């Protein structure tokens, strides 16, 4: 087999990268197509197109209705063909960043994504989240093409609820777990192969990352400020985690994720929330040693992620929905399947709530 | 001296091994003879002998009185002749089981067991412990040939209650210490001869297993559910141990329990939980370092063993009692006398009482 | 998704072992129909037959052939009957002892292996290699059982050639890179399942045992003489690596050798010494550290074991034959296709080459 | 100049070594004249002279007054002389024990000291602590002859009152550190030159059997049984701390306990509860690491000896009796310049004061 | 169940020690009886009596014929007793010195030992080795008091030939093994009971400081020259290996070189190196790891030690002579059976031959 490993073209990171990024942007085309939400439009919008105005870019700024749905991105690319924008930029949140990434595919054109929040690993993926325009999730669109650029002010990124920063090193914490039981299991990734080592170095850089910055990286973000562990958290939940998850390969704690979206209890938690629970289920799942629980329940502990379904919201009726929640996550398709050796139903009911009884022991001890 | 390890000839363990192990049945006997009492002959009994029949396998059943007495074992021979099978399996308790390995040893017929529960290490040995009807011990019946299969179905043996797999690993816990105490005295075996290399090394691995898995396992088996924590401790509790105490040796722990029953206060108390504290009693008597103890009471602790005379019931006369227990772990034929050393009635009194206020000092501190 | 270990019933090993093993062995039997060959029955035939008389066991004496083929079998088998003879004793090298394997299945009896040499791990396996009359290989017969018995008097191996034990430690290092392998590949082991933690514990225990003691040993088999060491080495070589291929699995290594047996050139070289070279060859090809492949390399030229291509006989016509090895070695069946990734003829060609290479550099340093 | 080391001719120990001492006590003399105080004489003095007896030796036993004074030494020689006894044993405790000596070296005759507790490091010494008969210090006799013999029975040694046995480890405790200093020093030892390795050794021996065992020892005591850390901390005690403090050297620690006498308030603490302290002091004086002085604190606080001056009844005036203190601390003659460096009066007050503030702060953690 | 250590009441070391120690011994008698023959007596008889002189004990010096036999000490003590001497000194080598021992106890007199050589570990021991006047061995007295002084005068000590020095190494490598051998076999010493903790430090503080001394300690006795690593190693050799061998125990080192004296072509080996040569025997015995073995081997060949059969003068008719030693080694009261095993002349036959084989190996590398 091939060993395959996928990037974006270019990753920019730092204070004021919004306003600097003209410079790279203006090799990819000579005008921009610039998507944002209100909120996102008039507190990064302004400045970002002041700055492309500055290096001799053309613009024409457009809002963005809050959804990534078909009707909401061909609605969008029908104005875009109005104004024959040669390039897009998506500024904001995950959906308005996978409408931009949908509507530089399907017009050949090149994609710069602005996210204003580094709570997720999916602005560097070639990958689109679909939904319906009511918010039901569709389809998953994996594209041939990682975006042309990233661009991370940090500045923006430090002013952002603590909450998100937290969520994205939930997210980045599944990494190297995942991305090690693919290389285990020989396990395809999205990329379209084996593992390269590079991979899955920079999937394990994000987990040692996480442990020896995510403390100092979080207090600056809770005073709403620039220091360099934000940066190496940044840097591990977007560009480490990213290439980490697409070129490395998923496994259980996504799946488990996936299976944990059935319960309406959980539709309050944030996607990386859910995600480092299910990372801790996959430790009890693969039989990790006690002092590696140990390190990662201290880790959600401290920084303020969920190690028991009372904290995820599910309360009640917990062996019928664990057992609802283990099926949905072993359904055909899903990345568990991608771990090196046999899952079962029965055996991901009996990690999740181990797993659970784990983080209920830590946090009373 | 000649080096010993005897075993039985196979040993499965995982989900629905009850259900599974036809296959390797099939090539022992053409029938099979199978005991239980009615509380296990409903849980597992029906299941057990639908997969035997479903290998073409030819079967009778029959209910078990709930003692491994001479009585009782001649009753179900009587049954066993009528029949004409070929074989004998076992379904349940020690009791159950030990019944089952005499009527294949006098009837010179293969022996399977299947233990319900992972309490003792008494499954893989030649070994039955004889009881009178009326319940009090008689003897013990060492036979030249193990069981010919044992077989763990750990779906069934996750939903026993906790505490009998507890009392399992207090079983377990003491293999190392007698092993190595007879490894180092040069003390002979059940198996016949000195320790082999192999039976002293998964002697320490058992040891190994048990503070690294314990607790994970525990967990698991508070929730009723099956991990690889489980796995591993049932092994730990059945193979590891079993193999341990047989062909590497039994010494002071085991003596000390012996001396135990004398007390009607400990009667209460399952085997595995009186030899796990029989065994802080051993490394008291031994001298074992004081991190080595510290391990010790730490694991009992927190997985919920006695280390003080109180947690076994014993909280008044103590000088005059522990002074009889003392005599009578020294009688003569006692595996005491495998350690590595001078023992006495005065030296056991001696370890007994400083055990007990390590115990007490560790559980207030 | 069962666990599965199997074991002979007891295995002996010590100072004349075959003159005290009749205590254990007269409760399987109360008659023996021994077998040798007439090298074998003279040098310890005659000892075994006055000590199984001490204890009152009635006894038939047969000539071996030399050949352990279905012919073989049915004569044997067919002056048995006309004795009436209730178990079956082997004594000599494998041949001799696989065909009272069969017997013992065929006719339904217990089974007493004694082995003269300590050269392969066979003796405790429930495996017989069938040959024709003329001494071609025909096929492997697989046994639902072990020998009941496994007998090994350490002063009878010790005078027996240095170059037999130490092809023995060159069948015997194989067996924990080929256990570890399986384990990693979740492949199933003769036994029937997955691997006990047991089964890979001895695998590794045997390995160790060959760094820490095989040099010590080896000297003492030179001098003809019985110390601890060659003990130690004699249990790993027969019940360590015995357990650890049949209990834990067989990959690249055996297959290695499966597929050099097509080169007469190779035809003057032991089982064991064309394992350890394979062994070799599997390191180069589960990339296993240069330390590991130094720490291997450096006992095989220390103990007199092949390290590269020609120290086997292959001098000439290289590319050519090691491209043919490698296609007989990838054959439907074989044991190569248990290791954790994918394997094709083209990588094992690879692997032999570059192995040769690492051992001719080895050689010259 | 020479290195010197001393020793008793035999050291006993065990469970009845009171009993068993007299094959060796046979061939020091045919009779001996026997010594204790009333509560000595009825508790262990009758086994003493029955076993003396048994091995054929003529005895006189005679009372003890109390006090180890020159008076009752000419009182007690004119009844040896009447009954013309050919040796002297003492049993007791240390003013019986030195009595016993000084009536051995002015009639030339073998000694036998018999400690019934294990308090102090006095009864394998070549030295008297002479005493008025009211009770005050007159001198120091010093012999050119170490006891004959030393006996320790730890039957009864265990049932004496704990506290005993702990000042006796604060007695040891010090011997290291003393030792040590003496060594650094270049000192003259009572032995009367440089330090041989052997003594130093016996010293650095001394100090980590009290940390390995002392713990374990005083759970033993506290139940007034014998286990093997109770024999080894009572060679500690007595041996170890014994052939250390007099062939290596006395230094600050033991200077500084004979400071704290000139306070009334300090009358109450026995030697080598004032000699912990004292040792604490030493270590704030040559400036011992802190990891240094937390164990040492530690083991203080674990086992029950005072490591702040509030615990040895100094509670007022500190300022002008540690002063005091400090000045009969530096008195000529004394062991504190055995110090590799100067001292002074100012700086044992320094010593003293911040050593009280580091056990304050320790006990208050 | 007594430990017993016995030492000489006192042991001096240092340059001019011969002309420095009669302030020590003036305390021990009034007069002395000073022996040794005409060698030692030119070289350091005078400079001893002058001292002695010096401070104010009389003498008379009276010549040694050469061997300690019963006649000879019966015609010193006639002479001994017509000048009605109060003590005993020796001066010289082993057989010197063993024969004021023994006069010493048959006239109820203090002893004094002054070694000129240190090439064994007798001169601190309670035994004297007897011989007939022809020279051939007759028996062994074994006192109750050890010598009451042991004087080592490191500048005569240093100017002898360095192989007598190197076979004192030998003879103090063993005192480790042999006495941790009878440690852990339980086995009584000569003092009369188990080993104390101090005796067995010693014994472990000897090893230690031969490999760390041993190589400085030589090139300074090549050199004829007193620095402090012969200091060091003059100690192992005299005080830490005789406190050692008499109070931890002798094994199976000292009985193979018992065994070794039936070969003539031995006889001009010295005690230490066939003791040395003894010692890797005893590991290969109990089967010591490869890194000891190497260890010891390193420091043999380092110093000049024998570790091969040719360096100790057996060339040919090997088989037969190491069986005759072999016999010889397990003859009945022999120390071997103090190790923790069963020992049997075939095994100490195989431990000889193959420690040879390892000792080749060694020096051909
Ligand atoms: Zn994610
Ligand atoms: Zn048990
Ligand atoms: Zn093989
Ligand atoms: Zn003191
Ligand atoms: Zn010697």
């Given at each position: 087999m091939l060993k395959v490993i996928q990037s974006p073209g270019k990753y920019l990171q730092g204070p004021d990268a919004s306003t600097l990024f003209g410079a790279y942007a203006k090799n990819l085309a000579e005008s921009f197509f610039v998507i944002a939400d209100d909120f996102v439009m008039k507190l990064?919008?302004?400045?970002?197109?002041?700055?492309?105005?500055?290096?001799?870019?053309s613009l024409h700024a457009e809002r963005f209705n809050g959804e990534c749905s078909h009707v909401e991105i061909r609605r969008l690319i029908a104005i875009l063909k109005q104004h024959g924008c040669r390039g897009v930029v998506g500024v904001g949140g995950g959906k308005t960043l996978d409408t931009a990434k949908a509507i530089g595919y399907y017009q050949k054109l090149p994609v710069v994504v602005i996210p204003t929040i580094a709570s997720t690993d999916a602005p560097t993926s070639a990958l689109s989240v679909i939904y319906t325009e009511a918010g039901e999730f569709e389809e998953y669109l994996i594209y041939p093409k990682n975006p042309d650029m990233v661009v991370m002010d940090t500045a923006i990124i430090a002013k952002?609820?603590?909450?998100?920063?937290?969520?994205?090193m939930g997210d980045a914490l599944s990494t190297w777990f995942e991305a090690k039981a693919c290389y285990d299991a020989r396990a395809t990734?999205?990329?379209?192969?084996?593992?390269?080592?590079?991979?899955?170095?920079?999937?394990?850089?994000?987990?040692?990352?996480?442990?020896?910055?995510?403390?100092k990286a979080r207090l600056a973000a809770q005073a709403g400020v620039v220091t360099d562990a934000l940066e190496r958290i940044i840097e591990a939940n977007t560009?480490?985690?990213?290439?980490?998850?697409?070129?490395?390969?998923?496994?259980?704690?996504?799946?488990?994720?996936?299976?944990?979206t059935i319960l309406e209890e959980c539709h309050h938690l944030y996607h990386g929330e859910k995600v480092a629970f299910g990372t801790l289920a996959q430790l009890?799942?693969?039989?990790?040693?006690?002092?590696?629980?140990?390190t990662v329940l201290g880790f959600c502990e401290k920084v303020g992620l969920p190690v028991t379904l009372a904290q995820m919201g599910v309360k009640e009726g917990i062996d019928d929905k664990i057992a609802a929640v283990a099926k949905a996550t072993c359904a055909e398709g899903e990345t568990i399947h991608n771990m090196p050796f046999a899952v079962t139903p029965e055996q991901v009911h009996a990690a999740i709530l181990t797993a659970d009884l784990l983080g209920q022991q830590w946090l009373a001890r």
């Open positions: 990064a919008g302004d400045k970002v197109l002041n700055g492309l105005h500055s290096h001799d870019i952002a609820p603590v909450r998100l920063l937290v969520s994205g990734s999205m990329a379209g192969g084996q593992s390269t080592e590079a991979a899955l170095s920079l999937a394990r850089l994000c987990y040692d990352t996480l442990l020896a910055e995510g403390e560009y480490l985690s990213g290439i980490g998850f697409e070129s490395s390969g998923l496994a259980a704690a996504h799946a488990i994720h996936n299976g944990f009890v799942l693969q039989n990790s040693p006690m002092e590696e629980i140990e």
